[PDB]
Design a protein around this ligand. Sequence first.
Ligand code: CLA
Ligand code: CLA
Ligand SMILES: CC(/C=C/C=C(C)/C=C/[C@@]12O[C@]1(C)C[C@@H](O)CC2(C)C)=C\C=C\C=C(C)\C=C\C=C(C)\C=C\[C@@]12O[C@]1(C)C[C@@H](O)CC2(C)C
Lengths: 212, 42, 197, 153
Amino acid sequence: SSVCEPLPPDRPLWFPGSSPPEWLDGSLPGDFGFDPLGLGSDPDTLKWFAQAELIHSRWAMLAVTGIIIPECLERLGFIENFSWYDAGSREYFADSTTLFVAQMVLMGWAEGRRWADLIKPGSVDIEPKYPHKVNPKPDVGYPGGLWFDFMMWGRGSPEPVMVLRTKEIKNGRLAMLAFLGFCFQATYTSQDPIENLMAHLADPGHCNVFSA
Amino acid sequence: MRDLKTYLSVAPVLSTLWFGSLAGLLIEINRLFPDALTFPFF
Amino acid sequence: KGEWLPGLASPDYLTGSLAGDNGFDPLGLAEDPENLKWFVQAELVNGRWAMLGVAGMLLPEVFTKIGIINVPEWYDAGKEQYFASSSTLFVIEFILFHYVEIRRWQDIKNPGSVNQDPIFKQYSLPKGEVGYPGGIFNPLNFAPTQEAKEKELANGRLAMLAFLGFVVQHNVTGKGPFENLLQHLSDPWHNTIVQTF
Amino acid sequence: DISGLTPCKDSKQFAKREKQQIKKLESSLKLYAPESAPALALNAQIEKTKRRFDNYGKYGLLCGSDGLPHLIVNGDQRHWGEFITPGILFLYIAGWIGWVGRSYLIAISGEKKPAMKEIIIDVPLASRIIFRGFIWPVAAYREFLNGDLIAKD
Ligand code: CLA
Ligand code: CLA
Ligand SMILES: CC(/C=C/C=C(C)/C=C/[C@@]12O[C@]1(C)C[C@@H](O)CC2(C)C)=C\C=C\C=C(C)\C=C\C=C(C)\C=C\[C@@]12O[C@]1(C)C[C@@H](O)CC2(C)C
């Protein structure tokens, strides 16, 4: 039920007809053999890179959400003067430098607990114990937990665990690329992402990157 | 990447990385605090 | 006894026997056991002196502000005129600190060496552990249980950083500690270190 | 006023040196348009020069008959910032380095072929050893008292 079964060797690859490398057997989610350079050779380092991909993708997903959804609300008439690449320069309280150090303190606690999970899995355990009940030992990056799996979707309730982790990773790789598009086309157009979408959808031919 | 971290661990690659970082540090300090001849901060 | 960074393991030289042993030795200083039993004493004495210092440079200020008793603010307290000179205090604080600190030195060198008076040879001290003399240093006779030693070292580690905070909140701020606390409680998000610099 | 040196905020030759360098920069500033980028760089250098001379004025530097900041390295407190406060800041940092590279050499001393870690530095081991030398003076002190600082052959 909850085993994290891998993908088969005859799985879809990033490049059909190509040989997948031997260090991408399929144990990780979203394994399509993408390794033209082979940065995940050492498996002790490929674990760290899988955790890197997972956290990078989760942050990129929350970020693309926090960029496009609030812009949809601005178009609906909820938020004023919204522009994500100028939303750090605009005014708040706490000067944006007290906010930074408070952020570093709180995220240092959080990401330090996550780091202690990465170095040694059982150190910072949560989901407190109960009498005559066994909380299952989780994996790194997928802690389960009362705080991060309160709907119990991680152990494989609606779908298997491998396909759900692959959903996370694929949706999140797409979000990572979406945020790269945000960081690039908000500086080479000096405009809004949703505005750029509607502008390309107006005339897809001539409203492309080559106009600028 | 296996055996690239061993190459980057080698004495000249590691020395150029350390001294590039260190030289950039000194360079940016001298941009921030140029023309220094005393330590007045106590 | 506990752990300061759960991702890290307590080193082999910190077996949890000592008081305050949360396993904090990332820089491997107390790796030799002689260094460990010397730095236990250095911690205890710096922490006890820091507790006395903080209590003697903060409690004057929380009583000056509320007006119960007016007293200087620990940095203008040297320039005040006392019944002796500015150096006579240093002479006395040398004469009768050399004696008490060298006797503590002889204690932390060999424990059972220095426990009786030079003058009144009968009034000895009980055989307590090193850094915890007892006897006339325990007149109310509160027991030196391990929980009490842990409480001592915790308040002392806190008072050490409190003194450091005082020195750096007068070095690059110019004002006193409690005034800085009231300035923080006035507007916490606008009266911090990242506004002074 | 030690060693027969007037201070630099009071030395007329120091201000004359300032004015000479500033005029030498301004004579190179006339050839460029006042809004152009070389002119702005020259003006930034001019303000750098002016505040450099002001800072050598305010930091207690002593100027001789030639009108140049001399360093009094003897031990006078007024000029500790010229030699001793940097000097300790050297002996710390330098003693960081030697206490690190020594400690590393002791940590790779017990290997089979310990020479292939001299040319191929263990970055994890070196990063563990690097911050050991942060508070190096107490480690060196205690190792001197424990005899671990000097090999016994
Ligand atoms: C934070 C970035 C990041 C990281 C660390 C990983 C890490 C990993 N990926 Mg994932 N991946 C990512 C982003 C990332 N990915 C994105 C954005 C995509 C979509 C484009 C994919 C698509 C993908 C597929 C399809 C597959 C993987 C696989 C893997 C594994 C092997 C590759 C490896 O070790 O690379 C380590 C990578 C890095 C250390 C980052 C590279 C950093 C260097 C400096 C280059 C960066 C510049 C870049 C080229 C700029 C883009 C330019 C733009 C024009 C496109 C490993 C777990 C394989 C796997 O087994 O899945 C689990 C697999 O089949 N990835
Ligand atoms: C050995 C002889 C010698 C000496 C004593 C000096 C001394 C100096 N030179 Mg000269 N120089 C020399 C040889 C020498 N130089 C040679 C051989 C050349 C040709 C290559 C030059 C070319 C040269 C130029 C072109 C310039 C200097 C400058 C300087 C000054 C350096 C200011 C600076 O950036 O430091 C600032 C301090 C640092 C960079 C050290 C920072 C170290 C880091 C941050 C760690 C410190 C913190 C640490 C953690 C401890 C904190 C304590 C605790 C909290 C832990 C200083 C007076 C500059 C100057 O101002 O002119 C006077 C300048 O412009 N020198
Ligand atoms: C003794 C002490 C203070 C004593 C203060 C006194 C008497 C004050 C007296 C006065 O104010 C009054 C009463 C009244 C004023 O009128 C006069 C004065 C004179 C001004 C402070 C110690 C203060 C000591 C401090 C701040 C020490 C901090 C040490 C730290 C943080 C160590 C960290 C680590 O060493 C460990 C723990 C383990 C390693 O492995 C890793 C690292 C990280 C290296």
